[PDB]
Symmetry: C2
């Protein structure tokens, strides 16, 4: 039997609904989203990582100039210094006191580490929504996994399930993202070949394995110090190493809608935004005929206590007379009153208990048992503890239009001045009428 | 020295621009898009391919009933038939004339073909633009390849080039596409698990090596014929084998803007749409001081013949005096006239000749030679040949007003009608003024 419904896109809250097949007993489903995953489509622009600077042993020309020369390497720089006279441990290295020169040359490369310590700059396109769901019927507690595409029907225990797409098209990932490990960031990273010295992207590669290193480190060689064979230089420190210190909190902490964020694959999970359609077929053997029911009548309903506790702070007694032993479903007709139970056993002339939850300070609602309906009404006290660790187990209040019973003061004063206006108008009509008549 | 320009995004047409550095003799840059490529970002929804049906030997129970054992295979079916009496080549297979039964069972799988003969259904998220370009200065053709991101500067022959961003989003791929080999198609393929019998998508899997076969063939078994041991059945013929026939024309033959389309990876090429921004920073060593250059004087244009052909249909001769031998730029100040040449050379008192292309019926234009301008004028006779095998070597006409000389017929009739109105209005104003003087 085909049935169709919509549940809010809120993880870990049970939403509960009535299958009402014509000619057969009703039954109550409940289901909850165990997980919802948005998963964007990623375009790699470039990999950023720590650079190394390569500085070969400097060539020193005794008694003449070294010729300078060009080379094509990613940030290559070169100079010839004149009037050097280096000493090594045993003596002066040069045969004459002056007219020597030192060539010096350097270039940047990816570090050996860039296999492991690197970050990825991605553009992120729209997302392959996926979902995981628990459902309960007649004591069959069962789980299903699916895409949210509104097709791809999954069968289990000869039931069949279809889900999505959700009404929301929001995602926390912006058009540009960077990922490092578990951390992923919305940031407007510089395009390939656009990155400055000493900032994220001062060195870039199209892929982690490519040799086409872009680098912009502003390396400058400097005059070697007196008597000494070293190669001094000046250069902006790694823009990556600085970003690792500066970066701040990733989307796992900063993101809207209470969502959780994960990597490989890049995912956003359990976003509390919008609502989700689902359709379910349950096998026609799972229904008892409307005459095979317990057949119960002459109900009345009673409320020992009620409290708007964000969970099942209401408790009620239902009186009944039932023709035989039989399993019975129970459900609440009104969106502002959710119910803990779903099915129960009845026999004979007796009474039964249920628990319920509401925002209402005066709970008025109808309970649909097996085929048959009863009205329930009681005053509901406020809860006493302030803050709690779980989301409210019911719909929000109609704050404009579901004020309490004993708000009848509003009707009492509205008639208390509405009749004053009525008499004022009727008086004015009579005196106006005689003034037209004469 | 840095110069910026924009050229129409139209492959294989050369465009011309004038390098301008104050205090240095000018030079002319010619460039040509050799190709431009859009590569869309693909997410694989599923593979499809020819199915195979598997039909094991039928179990025949002599002298009793066989019965189904169910199993979750991708399009499984089972049936049992009664009163069968199968023969084999030597006689009856069953011991007795009736009370026999044949179980028949079947399912479907991917064929073994699906590594070779398959089609691939993709979503196609936004593309990245790659461009291959030729450019010419200092007598040398040079060629550069870049991403058109607008920032990824490429250096070649000691000059630095940057290109893009692409000034339009337009892409020949729809949001969903399928590919086969070289063929790609825009089509609204059915979602995963949504496929109908006898159409594209009647068997699907999320990768070609996966075992997650969705299938919907409507396979149904039939009762065997008299005396015979086979398994007859009805099934919708493999919908991929029909789509290989019913295929239509791939986007390579049907797409807008005259583009070419190819696979590995999927690419659109040479879409003649929008325009391409370019910046080039040629070395300061390419210039020579204007105080040294052979700067022209007494320049006198003449145009022996002209036609608004789609190639260089007109020719001009310039009488000149020049102080010394040297290089000399030529460029056209009027967008409706394109000069063929670039950086000619000049000496003495003499003449030179140069060729141009134009849509103008009565070409008048200014030619900027080295550091100085001359005014040039002609009548154009229309080309004799309808149809040519190449695009126009000139700008599209500003036909909103850009038109012949001997349009002075407009000045004649608009002047005559203007004067008869002006005289009629003056006569009215005089008589109106003296009849106001009363």
């Amino acid at each position: 039997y085909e049935h169709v419904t919509v549940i809010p896109n809120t993880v870990g809250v049970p939403y509960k609904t009535l299958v009402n097949r014509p000619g057969y007993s009703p039954m109550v489903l409940e289901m909850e989203l165990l997980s919802v995953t948005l998963e964007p489509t990623l375009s790699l622009d470039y990999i950023t990582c720590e650079y190394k600077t390569v500085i070969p042993s400097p060539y020193v020309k005794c008694c003449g100039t070294a010729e300078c020369k060009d080379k094509s390497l990613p940030d290559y720089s070169c100079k010839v210094f004149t009037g050097v006279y280096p000493f090594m441990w045993g003596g002066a290295y040069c045969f004459c006191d002056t007219e020597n020169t030192q060539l010096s040359e350097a270039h940047v490369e990816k570090s050996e580490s860039c296999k492991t310590e690197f970050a990825s700059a991605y553009r992120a396109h729209t997302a392959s929504a996926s979902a995981k769901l628990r459902v309960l019927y007649q004591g069959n507690n069962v789980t299903v996994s699916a895409y949210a595409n509104g097709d791809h029907a999954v069968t289990v225990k000869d039931a069949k399930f279809i889900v999505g797409p959700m009404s929301s098209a929001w995602t926390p990932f912006d058009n540009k993202i960077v990922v490092y490990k578990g951390d992923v960031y919305n940031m407007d990273y510089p395009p390939f070949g656009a990155g400055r010295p000493g900032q994220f992207g001062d060195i870039q590669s199209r892929t982690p394995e490519s040799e086409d290193v872009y680098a912009n480190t502003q390396l400058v060689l400097q005059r070697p110090s007196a008597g000494t064979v070293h190669v001094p230089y000046s250069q902006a420190p790694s823009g990556f190493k600085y970003w690792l210190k500066e970066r701040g909190a990733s989307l796992q902490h900063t993101a809207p809608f209470g969502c959780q964020i994960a990597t490989n694959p890049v995912r956003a999970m359990n976003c509390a935004v919008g609502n989700m359609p689902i359709s379910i077929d349950i096998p026609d053997a799972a229904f008892t005929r409307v005459v095979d029911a317990p057949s119960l009548t002459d109900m009345s309903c009673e409320v020992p206590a009620c409290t708007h506790s964000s969970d099942f702070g209401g408790v009620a007694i239902i009186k009944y007379a039932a023709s035989k032993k039989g399993k019975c479903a129970v459900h609440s007709m009104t969106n502002a009153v959710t119910i803990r139970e779903a099915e129960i056993e009845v026999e004979g002339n007796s009474q039964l208990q249920i628990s319920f939850s509401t925002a209402l300070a005066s709970a008025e609602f109808r309970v649909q048992v097996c085929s048959t309906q009863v009205h329930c009404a009681a005053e509901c006290h406020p809860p006493k503890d302030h803050i709690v660790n779980y989301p409210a187990s019911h719909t929000t209040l109609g704050v404009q239009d579901i004020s309490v019973t004993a708000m009848s003061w509003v009707q009492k004063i509205t008639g208390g001045v509405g009749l004053v206006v009525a008499v004022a108008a009727l008086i004015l009509i009579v005196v106006l009428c005689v003034s037209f008549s004469r």
